[PDB]
């Protein structure tokens, strides 16, 4: 009576092991545990979304509203939350778009599931309700698609793709951020129309260089790569033009050394007198063949000795240091050169072409300009990003990567397949699934009808973060979808969406004039990952933890 039996025969497992099952409201606590980090990403959704500050154990601060990036530095405890954490990371890697949608959609499916479990629905019937409703959801997305990107590159068409994606990440000015990203995309495209070749694109081609100081309006697009380097011998503006011939060596420039027990052997004083002048003639003979080919610049991948740098300054040859690997790999893609390990005369067919190499002060340090010109086009262009704070420079770099990943969505599928934006995609699916829930007899209609209710978070989040009442604005939007379709065709009511601030009362007419759209390839995987993330949590009846 004084002390409990304290769960007898509990010594079967270590004291650190704990057992949590769907019974005793723990499945409700798991859903309630999602709402703790769910509201964190709700205020970050949309162009009016709010960025968050997360301080790690090392002191690094990353300010971003992206749900996939924020969950990286955070330490997660509850096991089912890691299901939601790792689900948002896959969406960022695969499609590079729709990261905040997976975080919000998977969290709302568990919120509506709390009422489903309370009514007595078994975990098996709840899973079957979402799987049957998701298959109908993916089929309706292909029916509601409007427009297409058609040609690969266009000045106007690239403003309907990258611009609406970068509007949510660091909104700021619209046309300023859209022109910087859209310019670097046109350079890495092979074009070559009418040839019938298979298009190709690389998401790592465009590199963002973070340089503090200045302003966003002073940013520009550089066709070449930009590094922080100090020329050793001399600096040259290279005003003599006629372009240049450049060679790249992944191996360092120095006398070849034996990999085992390199040692100077001198038997007599006769060999010692010619040893000092012997090494000078070796580099002279090797560097003379390079200077005879007209090579004004040499790219090195490791440390170069001083004896090798002497003859390079004699013929006026620039010296570049390219540490590690990936930095040197993208240099040859600009000039179209093939590295070779030997120090001999390079092949003329493997030499690159760079017209000008300039060194100027941007952020206070000397940077080398690899920028290309109209002719002899180059690939893997870089974008100079100027900003006052380094924290803004980090997320804008990821904001540009979101636009670069959107270009990848123009390659694998048949086209761009633009979808109505401003939340109009998830709202139209509500009326279609509602009719789908009635067409299916049985008890499975409870999970199907509530599956469309979870799509109401998109219009409510955009309206709440915009400083508007969700009770006045949201029902007024259904008035366009409550009139169904008339006796005549050409119905433009599908373009209605949620507006931020302004005059409220729905607004922005039809979004076709706003030019903001969504990607179909993004919404396909965003719904599948978010559904499986909530399905995994609902499919686990018992959770076991260790040490805590």
């Amino acid at each position: 009576s004084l002390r409990l039996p304290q769960n007898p025969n509990a010594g079967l497992f270590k004291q650190g092991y704990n057992s949590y099952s769907n019974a005793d409201g723990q499945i409700i606590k798991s859903i309630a545990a999602i709402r703790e980090l769910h509201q964190m990403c709700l205020t970050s959704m949309g162009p009016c979304g709010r960025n968050k500050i997360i301080v790690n154990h090392l002191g690094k601060i990353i300010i971003t509203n992206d749900a996939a990036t924020m969950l990286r530095e955070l330490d997660i405890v509850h096991p089912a939350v890691k299901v939601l954490v790792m689900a948002t990371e896959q969406q960022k890697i695969d499609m590079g778009d729709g990261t905040n949608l997976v975080m919000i959609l998977a969290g709302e499916l568990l919120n509506v599931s709390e009422k489903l479990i309370s009514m007595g629905l078994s975990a098996v019937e709840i899973i079957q309700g979402y799987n049957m409703a998701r298959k109908f959801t993916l089929k309706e997305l292909d029916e509601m698609v409007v427009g297409e990107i058609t040609d690969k590159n266009d000045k106007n068409e690239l403003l309907k793709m990258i611009k609406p994606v970068i509007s949510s990440k660091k909104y700021g000015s619209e046309d300023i951020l859209s022109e910087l990203v859209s310019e670097a995309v046109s350079h890495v495209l092979p074009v070559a129309q009418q040839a019938g070749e298979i298009p190709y694109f690389n998401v790592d081609s465009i590199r963002v260089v973070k340089i503090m100081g200045g302003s966003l309006s002073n940013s520009t697009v550089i066709k070449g790569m930009v590094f922080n380097r100090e020329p050793e011998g001399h600096v040259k503006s290279l005003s003599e033009d006629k372009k240049h011939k450049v060679a790249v060596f992944t191996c360092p420039l120095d006398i070849a050394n034996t990999e085992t027990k390199g040692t100077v052997l001198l038997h007599n004083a006769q060999e010692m007198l010619d040893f000092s002048k012997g090494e000078e003639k070796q580099i002279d003979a090797m560097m003379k063949e390079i200077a005879d080919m007209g090579v004004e610049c040499i790219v090195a991948g490791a440390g170069v000795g001083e004896l090798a740098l002497h003859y390079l300054n004699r013929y006026g040859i620039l010296v570049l240091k390219v540490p590690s690997k990936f930095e040197l790999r993208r240099l040859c893609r600009v000039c179209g050169a093939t590295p070779l390990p030997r120090l001999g005369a390079p092949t003329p067919e493997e030499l690159g072409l760079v017209e000008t190499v300039k060194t100027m002060e941007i952020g206070g340090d000397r940077v080398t300009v690899f920028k290309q010109e109209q002719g002899e086009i180059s690939r893997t262009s870089t974008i100079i990003l100027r900003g006052a704070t380094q924290n803004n420079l980090d997320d804008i770099e990821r904001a540009i990567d979101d636009g670069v990943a959107a270009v990848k969505g123009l390659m694998k599928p048949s086209g761009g397949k633009l979808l109505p934006g401003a939340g109009a995609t998830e709202i139209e699916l509500i009326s279609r699934i509602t009719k789908y829930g009635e067409r299916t007899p049985g008890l499975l209609q409870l999970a199907i009808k509530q599956f469309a209710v979870a799509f109401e978070v998109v219009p409510r989040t955009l309206a709440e973060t915009a400083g508007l009442d969700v009770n006045e604005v949201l029902p007024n939007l259904y008035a366009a979808h409550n009139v169904t379709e008339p006796g005549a065709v050409k119905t433009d009511h599908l373009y209605k969406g949620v507006d931020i601030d302004g005059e409220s009362d729905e607004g922005v007419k039809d979004i076709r004039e706003e030019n903001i759209y969504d990607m179909l390839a993004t919404k396909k995987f965003a719904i599948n990952v978010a559904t499986e993330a909530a399905t995994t949590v609902l499919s686990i009846d018992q959770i076991i933890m260790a040490k805590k």
Partner: protein
């Protein structure tokens, strides 16, 4: 009397030790009680390091979670060894051992000696083996029925995952075991089927591949990614920096000799490269349409990668050791260690060779073989634990299907084997059996413990286990006098019985034979242990 032998010691005997084996096995069975069955619960394991293990396999629960009770340690080692050889029966043995201890514990309190109780277990188990010969159904492999392999494979799939992943993985496992069957009849499970974890798309997009896939790809850009006709050359020799033998080294007299001796490092490397070029001179016919690839077991010196780039030769380094043995089954060639002796006969053949670069890692795909002797299964998953959940689901299904082709017989599932032993042992005359007197009681405890597994399946469905088995016993009563032989199963969907042969529920022959034999020895040794003590020098 142990306190006099040791200053500090802990021991429990007789009724204190009798509660050790009964209660500890009861808590362990309760953990796996909700596991058994296709509708069973799903458990996730999260350790202190951050790893996540999500599976329905009872073996992962025993290995990841430590057990302080020594009684379950004997059960955990028995349940783990059951999945090793037979690939199935981990949760089955735990339910047999834990229940048989409790079924025999009621008579121990009545004053019955444990030995005569365990003696009745062997008498009742030997009858299950004699009945097993008439219970099993013979299947002839000369028919090559594909539908038979589909229904057997779905037994383990529906338990671990739902019908979504079952329909996808059903033809994959069947196509994997199809190439295992050969005129030699020898079945080799490890080399024929592998599990390769890769995160791509969704787990439901898992597809089957008819040729070996590797984790490595071409490092040099000019290496052709897609090669129509490629001749695979097996090379177990590595071109790279060697141990050099204590590093003796070079000594140069003049600077001209310093670079003259440096060229000796490429003398040994280019010596073996000239043999590959001479081998390419035989296959040079139709060079643009065809191709030549090299797969090495060990890392290759990047200095020599530029040689294969000019000849458009794909090089693969740091390959696994087991993958070297399968290159003869996939392509059809032979292995070559020394490059001195080369022949076109040892060169393999492939109809399609391509590489798919996803992220930083690059994978090489080979398929479209004339007469491939082996295949692979590419596992795709959304998360790290999703790769392990499919790994444990497919691997457990491998031994289930592989054991079918080993023998000519197959065992029906759905609890038809456990219910049949209940009516057999209870209605059998004791004069034919070697057990008499009080040993008759030990046989009844073994027959009653077998009826919990078909009742455990019903506990996960929500139906009353007592009412659903009332119709099963009533059907078997009129089936003997109607001149009709039919096996009665348990259908958890409608809460009624069914036929395992019509529904397609089948169980492996080696799983149930080793489970009952294994579970009997565990529970017998626990009932015969009257004392548990702990002593040692630490």
């Amino acid at each position: 009397s142990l306190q006099l032998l040791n200053p500090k010691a802990e021991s429990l005997r007789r009724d204190a030790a009798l509660k050790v084996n009964v209660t500890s096995a009861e808590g362990l069975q309760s953990v796996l009680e909700t596991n058994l069955g296709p509708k069973g619960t799903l458990k996730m394991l999260v350790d202190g390091a951050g790893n996540i293990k999500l599976t329905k396999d009872g073996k992962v629960l025993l290995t990841e979670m430590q057990i302080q009770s020594p009684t379950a340690v004997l059960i955990a080692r028995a349940a783990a060894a059951q999945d090793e050889i037979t690939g199935d029966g981990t949760t089955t043995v735990v339910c047999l051992v834990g229940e048989l201890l409790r079924q025999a514990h009621r008579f121990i309190q009545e004053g019955v000696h444990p030995r005569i109780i365990t003696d009745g277990f062997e008498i009742a188990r030997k009858e299950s083996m004699k009945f097993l010969d008439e219970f099993k159904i013979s299947k002839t492999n000369l028919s090559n029925d594909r539908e038979f392999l589909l229904q057997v494979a779905r037994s383990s799939l529906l338990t671990k995952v739902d019908a979504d992943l079952t329909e996808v993985l059903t033809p994959i496992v069947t196509d994997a075991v199809l190439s295992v069957y050969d005129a030699q009849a020898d079945n080799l499970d490890l080399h024929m089927v592998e599990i390769m974890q890769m995160q791509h798309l969704s787990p439901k997009d898992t597809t089957f591949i008819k040729g070996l896939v590797l984790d490595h790809g071409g490092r040099h850009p000019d290496m052709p990614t897609r090669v129509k006709n490629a001749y695979v050359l097996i090379l177990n020799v590595s071109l790279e920096y060697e141990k050099t033998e204590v590093n003796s080294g070079f000594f140069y007299s003049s600077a001209d000799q310093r670079d003259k001796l440096a060229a000796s490092e490429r003398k040994f490397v280019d010596a073996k490269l000239k043999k590959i070029i001479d081998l390419k001179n035989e296959v040079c016919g139709m060079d643009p349409d065809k191709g030549f690839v090299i797969i090495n077991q060990k890392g290759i010196d990047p200095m020599s990668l530029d040689v294969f780039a000019k000849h458009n030769i794909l090089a693969l380094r740091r390959a696994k050791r087991r993958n070297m043995e399968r290159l003869q089954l996939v392509t059809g060639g032979e292995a070559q260690n020394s490059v001195e002796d080369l022949s076109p006969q040892i060169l393999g053949f492939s109809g399609l060779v391509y590489q798919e670069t996803i992220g930083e890692e690059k994978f090489t795909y080979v398929t479209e073989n004339t007469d491939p002797k082996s295949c692979t299964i590419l596992i795709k998953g959304s998360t790290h634990y999703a790769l392990a959940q499919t790994k444990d689901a497919v691997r457990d299904g491998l031994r289930a299907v592989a054991n079918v082709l080993k023998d000519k017989n197959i065992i029906p599932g759905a609890g038809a084997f456990y219910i049949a032993l209940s009516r057999y042992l209870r209605s059998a005359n004791m004069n034919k059996l070697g057990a008499k007197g009080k040993t008759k009681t030990g046989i009844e405890a073994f027959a009653e413990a077998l009826l919990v597994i078909p009742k455990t399946l019903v506990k996960n469905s929500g139906f009353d286990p007592l009412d659903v088995l009332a119709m099963v016993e009533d059907e078997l009563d009129d089936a003997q006098d109607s001149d009709e032989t039919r096996y009665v199963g348990v259908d958890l969907n409608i809460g009624d019985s069914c036929d395992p042969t019509i529904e397609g529920i089948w169980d492996s022959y080696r799983v149930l034979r080793n489970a009952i034999t294994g579970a009997t020895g565990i529970a017998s040794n626990l009932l015969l242990c009257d004392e548990l003590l702990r002593a040692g020098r630490s």
